[PDB]
Every structure is written in structure tokens, then in C-alpha cells.
Amino acid sequence: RFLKVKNWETDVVLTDTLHLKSTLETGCTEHICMGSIMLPTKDQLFPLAKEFLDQYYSSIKRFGSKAHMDRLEEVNKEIESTSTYQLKDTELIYGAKHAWRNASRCVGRIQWSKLQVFDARDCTTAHGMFNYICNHVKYATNKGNLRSAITIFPQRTDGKHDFRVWNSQLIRYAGYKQPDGSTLGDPANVQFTEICIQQGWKAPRGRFDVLPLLLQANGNDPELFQIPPELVLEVPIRHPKFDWFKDLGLKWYGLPAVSNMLLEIGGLEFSACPFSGWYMGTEIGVRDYCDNSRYNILEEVAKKMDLDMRKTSSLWKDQALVEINIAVLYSFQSDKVTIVDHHSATESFIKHMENEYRCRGGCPADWVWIVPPMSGSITPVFHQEMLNYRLTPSFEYQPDPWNTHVW
Template sequence: MTSADNEPAPLDADAAEGFLRMFHTAHPEAGPVGPRLSRVRDEIAGTGTYRHTPDELAYGARIALRDSGWCTSGLPWRRLKVRDLRGLRNAAAVAGECVEHLRLATNGGEIRPLITVFAPDAPGAPGPCIWNEQLVRYAGHPDGTGDRRYTAFTAAVREMGWRPPGEPGRFDVLPLVVETAHEGAKLFTVPPDVVHEVCLEHPDLPWFGQLGLRWHAVPVITHMRLSIGGVSYPAAPFNSWFVGSEIGARSLADENACGAARPVAEALGLDTTAERSLWRDRAVVELNRAVLHSFDLAEVTITDHHAEALHRLSWLRSRQRSSGGRPAFRLDPGAARRARAGGPGRFAPAPAETTAPQSPGRLAELLRRRAGV
């Protein structure tokens, strides 16, 4: 852990000015930029940072998503709904609202592009961070069962007190790890009832469903920080929707992930003794077909990699070149390590404290309180 990881960097006043000018150019109804710049300069001089207006926050989040390449079709970033929860710094509240984010984004299968923005970094008050790469990820167990990309993360959260709900399986949802400067790292179980999963079957292969493959519906990215006009939001989970090959080729087929290509190839009767037979390629095609077919059958929003490739070419031709002052999603080295290895913590030089995961009932209670039930 370095000081750059756990201490908020000094605010870049030039980035603040560049962003505000950009915002006022795009929103002339906001009035002249001069008075706003004057207030922001005074706020930075007095506190070391400044607070975005709700409109500035929403604009910055949409531009960051547009420029990130996560959703190049242009549709998700235009539809992006921004949940402004900058007042939340406690781990339980952050975890509860992440669960609410997943519920709202799933929307019965008609996926809603959504971002939830928690407290920013500020002098003497760093914001919370989320260790997980995505809100829903599957455990990787020591015997090779599950998603092997998260074997180290799984081992780390087991040391912190997490246990699978039963016998270790291929699709055990990992707990959410939220870390704050004043609480350390805390575990929270993601309630099963908000994890919408699609069971995979194939349009032409009746036996495919017997493989027992499935995948979650919404890719909520949780470990990237949102940077807008010099202000850094270390916890700002966001989602659009899946590209089919992210599931079929990268997550299910890859030997370093779920390793499903070989059993599919064997069921197809292919020669798996040599890569030259291209058994792996043929298996990946059938996995991708099964993903798209099953998501369509379940009426869950998804796109395919051919459509996404066309959108990306158009995006590359038209996008603005990035600069230091433009809003962006960023991944720092510490966050990348935590997402795969389960540490080290952002704030504590010692290993994260052992803590039993909070139950789904606790998160449900938080959500009920928020709704006033």
C-alpha cells in the first residue's frame, strides 16, 4: 500500500475549471460560467475541494461513461440514471445501496443503465471503496470449482469470515467487501433474491441445459473510481448490459475462469487432444450462441459482439480525445489488486480485520428503512 492509494490527492484546480467550462458550454441554461468558477475557487481555497451540483454530477458521470468505451452504442450513457448518494460513508449503508442498485438496474430483465455515486475523497475524509470487481462475481474454490479468476479473492474473504451457503459450487456469489477509513474492510452477503440469473440452454442442442451453466444478468462495475473536474469518487458502481461474448468466451469458456469449453467440446464429440482440431473455437461458438439464445428467451437485455464492434468503430471515429480535465472512470493499481487478490486494504497497513459477513436480512432492513416501510 502506498500513500497515493490511501490519501486523497490534492485537488487539481485546473481540472475543476476545465470541467466547469465544459459543463456550461453544454448547458447554456446554467448561465455564465464566471460566477460558478468564482464560488468554486473560494470553496477550494477554504476546504481543499468543492461540491458538484446534482446537474454537474449527472453530466460528468454520463460523459465519463460515454468516453470510457464500456458502452459504445450511445444508448446506455444517454439513458444513464444517476443516484446521488454522496452523503453515505458507512460500509453498511454503501453495501445496502449497492444491493438497491442491483435491484433497480435489473428491472425484471429490461436492464437500466445506472450509476450510484457515494462520498468523494476529500482532505482528511477519504471516501469508501469497494473491493469487488463487479457486484456479482462467483467464487473460485481450492478444488478448481467455480470461477478461477477469483480463487485468491475467495481465499481472502474466507479468512475474513465468509463461508459458502452450502457445499462449494460453481456459482456461489461472493460477498461484497466495503472498506472505509474509520471502519476497515467489512463483508456483506448479497441477498440471493436480487441476483437475477439466466440458466443457459442451446437453440439446437437439447443436452446443453444438463450442463447446469448459468450467469448473472447485470454487469455492475464496482472497483473503478469516477473522476470529475478534479474530484475523485472512489465508490461509484455503474452498469450498462452484457455483451454476450463477455460471458460465453471470457467467463465461461476460458480455462482460467470457469473452464466450460472442454465439457461442451466433449459433449459435441470433438477431438480435444490437440488444439489444431479447433475444438475450443467450436465450443466457444456454441457457448456464445447459448448465452444469446438464453438471455433473449429470458427477456434479459444483452448485445452481441458483432453489433458492439460496429458501435465501437463508430465511437472511435467520433469520440473526443481524452484530456486530464475530462470526466473519466479510472482503475488504480491498488483497486486492481484488491479485485483479484482480496487485498491489501486501501486504508489499513495490516491485514483486514476478521469479520462475519452481514446477513441478507440486515441489508433488507436497511432497504426497508430507506423506503420508509
């Protein structure tokens, strides 16, 4: 009932009760753990709304107040009629902040309460959506001094009027398959890079071509838009020692902005809710650059370093990986674009966990995602036991629109 989690490097022991309020499933059973698997009605709605409102009023110290009871009845009535409801502004903001607060896979949640929320619920067209996104991108980039934000479009109604941003992130590089059979640019987007062309986008066919937004409003077919370039902050990648590094032709965008997730608050579903914070170095340096199925640039860099790539045991992949990541961090800093190294980010997460345990009674966390993709055990989270469970409001995965859209 009252689970404890221990940190094996510092012996700190925290007790977890927050998990008792958990409501969603985890994919695991008492017979099998699926901790490493990537993707594990009016009657339905009111209970959800109630749990939320109750947690909402409890958060503002007005639990079981008239205001509390009143709104509960008000929403209660609204659902009974409209078979749905609308969140006050205060509720939309509390919900969004808490969905981030409950993202068990996010290592940067110590920043959760500073989220800037942009209410785009009055939006109606792909052009409108495009307007809101440009504003989000500009506000968040803030000339390199990034500020976390999320833009919330209209919630779901009948599922036949869903707003969706087809991109997986507001900003990503295109990927094209060549005659060579090889892939030019980012392989993970190869497909999307095609559905944009299956729409008319004139691809420059380069290594780092910023994709076009493909926005879908109220259910209609998506429309293409090109983000103003001066709004897309980019960082050329160089090394604080290897002058040859620049010759590699590497660069990345400064604003990470997940756009394909679904935000759930009080039972309400927001299918278009792009959000952004700022990068942890490793996301680019380790995953985007060195994943074999991504830009897969380990060999090249190893070559330039003239390393003995004859035997895995020389750890050339490892050496190169380190340099590369020193280069991503170095560049961003040099250009004054916000970025955090894995050591600093993981240290924050530990402090955040301690804060969350003593102020909220716990912190859902997914060890598999929290531990950085490099130097695992030299970061504190590696030695930190974590309990994973699902709390709401939350951010969830959802089918790619192009596998559900009735054109």
C-alpha cells in the first residue's frame, strides 16, 4: 500500500502514496512486467470530470466548498445536456500543467509549474492553427532563451471533428529515400516527408530541410504551411577542438516541440496540443545523431578522429559518441540557445522527485526513459528506484492521423 523507493548511491528512501490515486493501467500484471514496451459517453464523462474538479478544488484549498460543489453541479448539468463540457481557463491551465507534471517519462518536470498555456480553443481553420503555432514557436524560442509552452486547440466532440497537427514535432528535418536505396536526411520522417509531397510540398531534397506544417482543423483535410525561417532557430554544430567538425555539415533546431500527443483533462480530449520546452543534449547528440536508424553518424566522426574502428573493444563508437555530445552542448551554449546536459538535467530530476515526494507523496517515473541514453550509471537517476503509474490529467499517444483520416 505504502511503497518505498530507495536511491542506492545515497541511501535516501522515499515513501510513495501518490500512486494510490492512480487510475489507468500500466500494461504490467503480477506475472509479467512490460516496463520496456514503448506502447503498452455521458456515464463515462461525469465521473472523470468529478475526480478532476475535486483534485482541482483541493489544489486551491477549497475542497468541499460551495464554489466547489457549485461548479460540480454546473458541469454535471452541462454534461447531462451537451453530453460534454468546457473547462474554465483556470482549469485548462491547471490541467495542462498537471499533465506535464504526471508525464512519467519526462526528466525535465522540475519546470512543470512554469508552463505558459495558450488557449487556442476558439480556433477554426488550418490557417488559424498555423497562426497560433507561429505565435507559439516565436514565444517559446524567445531569441534562444527558451520558455516552455503548450497551445491547446479545440477538444474532441464526435471524433469526426478532431483537430490534429500531422507533424510529430512542430519542427523536424525531412527524410527522402534515394535511388541508391540509401536515405537522405532524417530516416524517421521519410514517410511524413512523402505525405507532404503527396500534398504538393516542394522538397529541396537536402540533409536538413525543415518540414512543412500539415494542419488539420475540425476534421477537414490537412493543409501545408511553411514556418517563417526567422522563427525557426537553428544551431550549426562545431567542436571546441576539432576544427574539422564543422566540415561535417551538422546542425539541429533549437526548439523540441512534440505535436502528435493527446492531452486529457477531466475526461476531455485535446487531440491537438503541441508543447515545447528545451533540449537535453543527449536527445540530439546521442539519439538523433548516433541512432543507427537516424542520422547514424558514428563511423564518419570516428574516421575523422582516426580511431581504430577495427575492433569494437577499442570503444571507438563510445569515444566518438562523447565528442559528438560535447559538440552539441558547446554549439548551443556558444550561440546562447537554451540546452541542458544529462548530468545537470538528471540532478534536477532527483531534486524534483524529493520535492514531489514530500509535497505530493510521490512522483510517477519511468526509469527506462529517465536514464539518459549514454553514461547511464554516472548520472544519479540510474541509482534511483522509481515507481511508474498513470495519473491524470496526462499526455497520451494517439494513432497517426494518416491511418484514420477519411478524406
